Design a protein around this ligand. Sequence first.
Ligand SMILES: *[C@@H]1O[C@H](CO[C@@H]2O[C@@H](C)[C@@H](O)[C@@H](O)[C@@H]2O)[C@@H](O[C@@H]2O[C@H](CO)[C@@H](O[C@@H]3O[C@H](CO)[C@@H](O)[C@H](O)[C@@H]3O)[C@H](O)[C@H]2NC(C)=O)[C@H](O)[C@H]1NC(C)=O
Ligand SMILES: *[C@@H]1O[C@H](CO[C@@H]2O[C@@H](C)[C@@H](O)[C@@H](O)[C@@H]2O)[C@@H](O[C@@H]2O[C@H](CO)[C@@H](O)[C@H](O)[C@H]2NC(C)=O)[C@H](O)[C@H]1NC(C)=O
Ligand SMILES: *[C@@H]1O[C@H](CO)[C@@H](O[C@@H]2O[C@H](CO)[C@@H](O)[C@H](O)[C@H]2NC(C)=O)[C@H](O)[C@H]1NC(C)=O
Ligand SMILES: [Cl-]
Ligand SMILES: [Cl-]
Ligand SMILES: [Mg+2]
Ligand SMILES: [Zn+2]
Lengths: 608, 11
Amino acid sequence: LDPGLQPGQFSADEAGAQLFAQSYQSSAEQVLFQSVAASWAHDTNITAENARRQEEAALLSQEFAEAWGQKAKELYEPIWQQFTDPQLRRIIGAVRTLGSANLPLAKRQQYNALLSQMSRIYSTAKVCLATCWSLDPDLTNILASSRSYAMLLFAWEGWHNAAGIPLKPLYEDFTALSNEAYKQDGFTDTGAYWRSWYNSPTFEDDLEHLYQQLEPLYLNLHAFVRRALHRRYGDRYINLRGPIPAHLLGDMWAQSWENIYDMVVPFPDKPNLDVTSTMLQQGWQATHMFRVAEEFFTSLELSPMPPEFWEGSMLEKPADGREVVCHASAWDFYNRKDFRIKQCTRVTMDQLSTVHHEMGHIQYYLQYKDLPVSLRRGANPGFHEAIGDVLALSVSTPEHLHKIGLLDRVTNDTESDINYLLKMALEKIAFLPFGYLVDQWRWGVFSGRTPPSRYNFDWWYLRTKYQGICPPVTRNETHFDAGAKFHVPNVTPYIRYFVSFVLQFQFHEALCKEAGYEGPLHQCDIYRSTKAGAKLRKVLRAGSSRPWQEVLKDMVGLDALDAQPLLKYFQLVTQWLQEQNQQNGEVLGWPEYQWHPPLPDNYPEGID
Amino acid sequence: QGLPPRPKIPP
Ligand SMILES: *[C@@H]1O[C@H](CO[C@@H]2O[C@@H](C)[C@@H](O)[C@@H](O)[C@@H]2O)[C@@H](O[C@@H]2O[C@H](CO)[C@@H](O[C@@H]3O[C@H](CO)[C@@H](O)[C@H](O)[C@@H]3O)[C@H](O)[C@H]2NC(C)=O)[C@H](O)[C@H]1NC(C)=O
Ligand SMILES: *[C@@H]1O[C@H](CO[C@@H]2O[C@@H](C)[C@@H](O)[C@@H](O)[C@@H]2O)[C@@H](O[C@@H]2O[C@H](CO)[C@@H](O)[C@H](O)[C@H]2NC(C)=O)[C@H](O)[C@H]1NC(C)=O
Ligand SMILES: *[C@@H]1O[C@H](CO)[C@@H](O[C@@H]2O[C@H](CO)[C@@H](O)[C@H](O)[C@H]2NC(C)=O)[C@H](O)[C@H]1NC(C)=O
Ligand SMILES: [Cl-]
Ligand SMILES: [Cl-]
Ligand SMILES: [Mg+2]
Ligand SMILES: [Zn+2]
């Protein structure tokens, strides 16, 4: 560790801890910057050499973290919990958590190499046949727009086999080392550490109680979509009393169903709420999507994107051939100047929403950039995920789309409302079971309830249990279908997305009230509301300096996650779908839980 | 801990 970066001496008391934290931040920023920079260099340009550079920077971060972590514990282990300065306790608590820095060198190097290799495998995997499709954009567009069962099956099977199978032995090794590292921080396993970020002794029970309130909405959306799919694909491939084949819902993970909106739209005579074609017809490109997102933020008197963002960001997939991580992401370089987005942006309505999601991350970074480095986080991770989604809730309203030139015809009638709420349910309600289940899978892997011998058995158990889908071809424990989802090999926790899909409607309700809006929750548009901007700004500027329950209370009047705002937003379509399924005599659920569809005849033969 | 926090990404 360079001498400038090493901790000196500080007294063993709260006034020394404060000087400790100030000396820390000085050097932390440099170490974070070099780490993030090397990660950026790799993720925008996947090369063996860039992976080597990224691993060296990771090792330096581990060295730094160990030195300052062990100093924090040497000087403050039994007194930091009683510090009078609550932000200083949060700072000290973070610095003394060593994570992978608890591992011996050789195991640190093994750990960093496993992260690199799992990342390279996921983001460079291809499906072939010899020319080859990448996940983004090739397979993505096939899942979104093909309606050929055999073709969707070719993309779904090909991707899951190509990405998941080679990852499995690496993921086993990563789990063991991760657990070894965090057990030396006092946690029973890594998942317990991840869950600790919500500082709630009843987290899993609280989530289970939210899901109980939401599940009826998903069950009715599912039954209704399943009927629509049956009318297109027929009784051979859709079982009206079984799970839906997992490749037919518009998305490689069946996690958002927006893309099948044209098959499910109940009133096709109303305005077409999927404005993708209008964006194409109009010549929208990535940089227009990012400027339109930015201007919503500035309409609220939040910050524009700095020049460093426009000069540094990667907003389209590189045409120079080179391999990149295409999964969108938002980057804080911890120097208070550089912030970027890396996105292989495609010109589509859901991508416009994803642009807002990612710019919400950036706005958080811009607003808390002057807090101590340790507090440059969301009040909890689900807060960070929710910011951009809240604005996107306003952007997608038919009235807002009209304002920005994407929907010439506007209508305020009950049919149009049901169309809109149904489209939003395909995006928001359909995701809830998946958002909930992914970290149930990973918590069980980390705790050892799901050993490698049951990785895929337990994944599909949860996928069927919650989402009511089945794999369209047979799977066994050679397959590792969880690894075919980006966040698993790239070790990004998931429960934040379940939390944010609940939270964002709590935020939306509060911001709409603050803006003086007095109509139905789902037609609210907070655009140009500076009062709403100021209320959002207060949350963003808090970072993680204060308990999330208190930040939430100041914002929305309640100190807990609550499904009532989401249920209020969707109420009309919740009632409509219930009525429809009854009249159609649907079975809610999937009691033929063993059912799987047959293979197409002439599969995979006829793919050319 | 140990490393920089993950870049923030969509579901
Ligand atoms: C779309 O239309 C709805 C419904 O409009 C209401 O019902 C129609 C059948 C017509 O009779 C309309 O004339 C009628 O207002 C609109 O929702 C309604 O918005 C108004 C505010 O614009 C709400 O009224 C207010 O109510 C609050 C108390 O809640 C009072 O303090 C205010 O002074 C004001 O009177 C009204 O409650 C609300 N109705 C419902 C059922 O939600 C909606 O605004 C409109 N949307 C767009 C984008 O135009
Ligand atoms: C686990 O599955 C793989 C592959 O399974 C595919 O799905 C099965 C239902 C069946 O249709 C397989 O033939 C499919 O390939 C099995 O591995 C393959 O096995 C076949 C048949 O023995 C063989 O021709 C292939 O070369 C094998 N490799 C691949 C990549 O297909 C595997 O044997 C199954 N069981 C175990 C324990 O792994
Ligand atoms: C992608 O990364 C590679 C390194 O793996 C970069 O290659 C270097 O490119 C410069 C010229 O631009 C040469 O001077 C170096 O010798 C190259 N290094 C190696 C190992 O070949 C490449 O520049 C990067 N691409 C982009 C677009 O940044
Ligand atoms: Cl966070
Ligand atoms: Cl999380
Ligand atoms: Mg789409
Ligand atoms: Zn995100």
